[PDB]
Structure 1
Amino acid sequence: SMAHNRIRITGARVTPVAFADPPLLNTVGVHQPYALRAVIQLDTDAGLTGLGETYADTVHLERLQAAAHAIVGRSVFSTNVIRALISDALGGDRTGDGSGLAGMITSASVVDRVFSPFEVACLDVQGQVTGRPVSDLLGGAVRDAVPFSAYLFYKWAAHPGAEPDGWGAALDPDGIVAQARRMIDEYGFSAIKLKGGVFAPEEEMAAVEALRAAFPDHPLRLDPNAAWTPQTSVKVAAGLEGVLEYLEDPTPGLDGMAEVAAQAPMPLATNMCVVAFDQLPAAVAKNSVQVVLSDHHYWGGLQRSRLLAGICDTFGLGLSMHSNSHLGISLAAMVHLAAATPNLTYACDTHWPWRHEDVVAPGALNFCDGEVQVPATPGLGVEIDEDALAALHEQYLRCGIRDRDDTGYMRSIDPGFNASGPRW
């Protein structure tokens, strides 16, 4: 079947999709009523198709098309070469670019964000053709299931002029505790994270303490997306001594983070000031953070995430995982990666509970007691449901949204709104 023992790329089909998202609040705005993703179907001359998933902003879709064209005629095992071809096609790397990430995270490598979904799709094909799960291409699983956290948000009851969702509003500690109960009853999550930077620090600390009261054994994390000054951060950290497993991005920039970490009794984590390999040396020299949140979508795929993990282990940094609104292809890739990473022991973030649509056939990624069992089948372990894919693509065409824009969407509701920060 494989002439010249060769299996190479013949093309890629990129399909933007949109799925319903509740009005989740963050420090820069509120989520739009649909979240956008792009599905990559990477086709080969063996007739095997690999899957990847990434952001769907306008400029990213154009880059994905240029990447797809550049890598036709390359072996799916030649991922080093494929990254270099993509770099050439994009005209090299670059920073200050926040696409797909709502301007929230603006320092990630453009080449890595574009390469990522193709690399994941390549590993999926490698696994299919060898009969091995993707975790076997990353040094093999070290655990049979991957634990995730409950990702809590302050939220309105409904998007303006729309039916309220089944969650209800969460705008204070009682509302946050109620949301946690509903989510944890359904999924079994053993660790809990709160998206903060929305209400005054003392009110978010109150929600944290209420969570601790309701869930005495659950590790807790708080993430205000850099909404605080370093002085305010140090007060929050002192006040939450012994309560948080870690505190993520309390304040903006490597210097401010280093200032806070010098006083904070819990470790600081980040997915804002360390989002690319070239930021690691400064973060290490300054002692800005103690925990790095991996994310294969912007670090450049699964093998490069494994590299990040080894760098963290070497330099004495803890390792967790960051997420954005995502579907089942991303989830499968996250699970294979975390399963194969010895030092990824923190529960991974996921936005899973907040969506109810998907592009893959069901059954391969069930949550049980807060964890997802790593698929043992060849490849990524999930397959496209073409009817579901077409439906979410049609939803994307109709919903009219073309870029993630939490701030712009908040402004369409509240014209004078600014994404100020820090706010406290």
Structure 2
Amino acid sequence: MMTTAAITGVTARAVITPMKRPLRNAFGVIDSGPLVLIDVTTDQGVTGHSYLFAYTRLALKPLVHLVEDIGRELAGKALVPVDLMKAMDAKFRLLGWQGLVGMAVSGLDMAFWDALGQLAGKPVVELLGGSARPIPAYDSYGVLDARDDERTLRTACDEHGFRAIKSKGGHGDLATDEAMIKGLRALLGPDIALMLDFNQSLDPAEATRRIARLADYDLTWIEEPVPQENLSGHAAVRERSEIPIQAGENWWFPRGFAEAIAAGASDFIMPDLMKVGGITGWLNVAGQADAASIPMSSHILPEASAHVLPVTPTAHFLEVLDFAGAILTEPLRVIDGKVTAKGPGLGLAWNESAVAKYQVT
């Protein structure tokens, strides 16, 4: 009530952390996750937190540069996430905010909202006018094998209570995809939802061919069958597909979603908070998905996702893949295959000795 807090500075650092569980692709395991950690100091005793997953270390320095540079021009500015977005939008209209820039802007938006929650002793979800209801979740893996992996899967379903599993495919031929899926369904029975993520690996005609073959296995969705930019190719797959098509982890801001929806690219979407424009963009897209009747899930950043899904009219699944555990004070918790938001703000605090250990520069 007294006055709106204001930004006094912004800091970001790189870390390469160990994964709680290495996930293995066709070539090899990934056991390292490169992140960027963002702090937005305010004039009211609160520093806002957020992280980005950066995919490859090659992106660490640029992202740190961009976050810090953008943050600097913001010092002195009132902490109003809507007005700040509009400012960052005007600022990159010509250079363009798709890509690394876009991640910097979304990261900052998350940090902003996080500060606002802290400053109120509330979780963001309550700022957003909803509550931290538990959200059905699914557990995300690389290339699963039924024999070689029965162990970890039993755990996910029985202890953590996961009622849905995602695996990857596409790397090889149709035979491998099918065997992998035949195994999984046999092993897990009919009551577990199985999702298959092709990670953009196919072209539209090949996607159509594989999907027809996999339809007998009761899949919940096929994810990014073709390159993410190829919206017309997604729509073409979607049109012929007996299985719901999921995509969206790689699209940029509300406009990026508007054009994908206009093209009818997918049955389901799963925006990444890093790429859709933070909490502020997410909410915009939530309204679009409501109008288009499209079930909306999240792509990673499970901690913050849990704050927006409860106010997403078409909320679907929260993806669980944990990259930020080892550097958080309070890793993510799944209870009976659901995640519940944690306050205050986004519930993101750094385990500083953890950070110091893993920091790269």
TM-score (normalizing by structure 2): 0.87
Partner in structure 1 of residue 12 of structure 2: 14
Hey, what does 1:68 align to over in structure 2?
71
Q: Does 1:236 align with 2:210?
A: yes
Secondary structure of the residue aligned to 2:282 is helix
Aligned pair partner of 1:278 in 255, 260, 265? 255
Contact 1:292 1:320 in 2 (8 A): yes
Deviations 1:249-274 (A, max 9, x none): 11231222222112111211113674
Q: Pick from 95, 110, 113 the counterpart of residue 123 of structure 1.
A: 113
**Residues 37 and 53, structure 1, Cα contact 8 Å, conserved in 2:** yes
Out of 164, 168, 180, the position equivalent to 1:195 is: 168
Structure 1, residues 214-263: CA drift from partner, whole Å, max 9, x if none?
22211111111122232222222222225111111112312222221121
| Residue 389 to residue 23, structure 1, CA distance change in 2 (3 Å) | closer
More off after superposition, 85-94 vs 183-192? 85-94
Alignment-derived partner of residue 81 in structure 2: 79
- Alpha carbons of 1:109 and 1:47: their partners in 2 closer, same or farther (altered >3 Å)? same
Counterpart CA distance in 2 for 1:90 and 1:314 is 29
Q: Which amino acid aligns with 2:296?
A: L
Post-superposition shift, 1:287?
Answer: 2.2
Which residue, 59, 62, 85 being the options, matches 2:62? 59
Summarize the Cα distance change of 1:7–1:279 in structure 2 as closer, same or farther, 3 Å threshold.
closer
Q: Separation in 2 of the partners of 1:148 and 1:179?
A: 17
Which letter does structure 2 place at the counterpart of 1:296? L
- The answer as to 2:347 corresponding to 1:372 is no
Q: Does 1:224 align with 2:195?
A: no
Deviations 1:296-350 (A, max 9, x none): 1111111211111110111222211112xxxxxx4321211122323112x2222
Code of the residue aligned with 1:117 in structure 2: it is G
- Check if 1:338 corresponds to 2:309: yes
User: For the structure 1 residues 26 and 295, does the alpha-carbon distance in structure 2 shift closer, same or farther, using more than 3 Å as the test?
Assistant: same
Match of 1:254 in 2: 231
Matched AA of 1:75: A
**Partner of 2:45: helix, strand, or coil?**
coil
| Residue segments in structure 1 that go unaligned for 5+ positions in a row | 96-107, 155-169, 324-329, 398-424
Contact 1:145 1:371 in 2 (8 A): yes
Match of 2:328 in 1: 360
2:254 aligned partner, one-letter code:
F
Shift in CA distance, 110/19, structure 1 to aligned 2, threshold 3 Å: closer
- CA gap of 1:93–1:278, structure 2 versus 1, over 3 A, is farther
- Secondary structure (helix, strand or coil) at the match of 2:269 reads strand
Report the CA distance shift for 1:301/1:370 in structure 2 as closer, same or farther (over 3 A): same
Instruction: Provide the residue aligned with 2:130 in structure 1.
Output: 140
The structure-2 alpha-carbon separation of the partners of 1:15 and 1:286, relative to structure 1 and needing over 3 Å to count, comes to closer
SS of structure 1 residue aligned to 2:319: coil
Counterpart CA distance in 2 for 1:378 and 1:333 is: 11
Choose which of 339, 352, 355 in structure 2 pairs with 1:386.
Answer: 352
Q: Distance in 2 between matches of 1:372 and 1:49?
A: 25
- Secondary structure of the 1:379 match is coil
Asked if structure 1 preserves the Cα contact closer than 8 Å seen for 2:293 and 2:314, the reply is no
2:148 — aligned with what? 175
Query: Helix, strand or coil for the counterpart of 1:71?
Result: coil
**TM-score normalized with structure 1 length:** 0.75
In 2, are the aligned partners of 1:92 and 1:111 still within 8 Å (CA)? no
RMSD, matched Cα: 2.6
1:291 has 2:268 as partner? yes
Q: 2:141 aligns with which of 152, 174, 178?
A: 152
More deviation, 257-266/282-291: 282-291
Against the structure 1 CA distance between its residues 46 and 127, is the aligned structure 2 distance closer, same or farther, given a 3 Å change threshold?
same
Identity of aligned residues (%): 25
When residues 204 and 180 of structure 1 are mapped into structure 2, their CA distance, relative to the original with a 3 A threshold, is: farther
How many residues are paired up?
351
How far does the alpha carbon of each residue in 1:36-95 deviate from its partner, in whole angstroms, 9 at most, with x for none? 11111211111111111114522222111111101111222x112322443455564527
What is the letter of the counterpart of residue 231 of structure 1? Answer: A
Structure 2 residue runs of 5 or longer lacking an equivalent are none
2:181 to 197, 208, 212: 208
SS at match of 1:130: coil
